[PDB]
Amino acid sequence: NSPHSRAMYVYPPNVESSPELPKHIYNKLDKGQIIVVIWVIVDKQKYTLKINHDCVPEQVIAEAIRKKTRSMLLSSEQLKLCVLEYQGKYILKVCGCDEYFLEKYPLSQYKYIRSCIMLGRMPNLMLMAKESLYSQLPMD
């Protein structure tokens, strides 16, 4: 079993039955876009993003990386390189909870995101190295 599969078994995605977003939830968004805060450990920097609610987790990470490296003068092709590398090496975690975004569902299909939208709370997500998460798995 891959480390990803073991992590999927130990921390199953907490998602709703369908990717269709109910009207009363969808209508609180800004033309379908949700504002979320992504934390990174650099020390901890915060990044506030506005993204399509149906971005899958890997696209959220791409956007955080885009925000973080803007004003760093990378060429167009270098930003794409950074994105590919950050994507495969990090996953998103809910701040203050052992819930992970391990599966490729739309962001708005995760219960935590839907709960934030309905309740008027800002979603706070932590960017976290895959190898850190895999270290949390039961030792042999």
Curated annotation (Swiss-Prot):
> Which stretch of the full sequence is covered here?
157 to 300 of 1068
| Miscellaneous comment in the UniProt entry for this protein | The avian sarcoma virus 16 genome encodes an oncogene derived from PIK3CA.
Q: Which organism is it from?
A: Homo sapiens
Q: List the disulfide bonds.
A: none
Q: What is known of its domains?
A: The PI3K-ABD domain and the PI3K-RBD domain interact with the PI3K/PI4K kinase domain. The C2 PI3K-type domain may facilitate the recruitment to the plasma membrane. The inhibitory interactions with PIK3R1 are mediated by the PI3K-ABD domain and the C2 PI3K-type domain with the iSH2 (inter-SH2) region of PIK3R1, and the C2 PI3K-type domain, the PI3K helical domain, and the PI3K/PI4K kinase domain with the nSH2 (N-terminal SH2) region of PIK3R1.
Domain (PI3K-RBD): residue spans on this chain: 31-129
Disorder named in the UniProt entry: PIK3CA mutations are involved in various type of cancer. Mutated isoforms participate in cellular transformation and tumorigenesis induced by oncogenic receptor tyrosine kinases (RTKs) and HRAS/KRAS. Interaction with HRAS/KRAS is required for Ras-driven tumor formation. Mutations increasing the lipid kinase activity are required for oncogenic signaling. The protein kinase activity may not be required for tumorigenesis.
Q: From which domain of life does this come?
A: Eukaryota
What does this chain do?
Phosphoinositide-3-kinase (PI3K) phosphorylates phosphatidylinositol (PI) and its phosphorylated derivatives at position 3 of the inositol ring to produce 3-phosphoinositides. Uses ATP and PtdIns(4,5)P2 (phosphatidylinositol 4,5-bisphosphate) to generate phosphatidylinositol 3,4,5-trisphosphate (PIP3). PIP3 plays a key role by recruiting PH domain-containing proteins to the membrane, including AKT1 and PDPK1, activating signaling cascades involved in cell growth, survival, proliferation, motility and morphology. Participates in cellular signaling in response to various growth factors.
Give the family per the record. Belongs to the PI3/PI4-kinase family.
Oligomeric state and interaction partners are given as: Heterodimer of a catalytic subunit PIK3CA and a p85 regulatory subunit (PIK3R1, PIK3R2 or PIK3R3). Interacts with IRS1 in nuclear extracts. Interacts with RUFY3. Interacts with RASD2. Interacts with APPL1. Interacts with HRAS and KRAS. Interaction with HRAS/KRAS is required for PI3K pathway signaling and cell proliferation stimulated by EGF and FGF2. Interacts with FAM83B; activates the PI3K/AKT signaling cascade.
Name assigned to this protein: Phosphatidylinositol 4,5-bisphosphate 3-kinase catalytic subunit alpha isoform
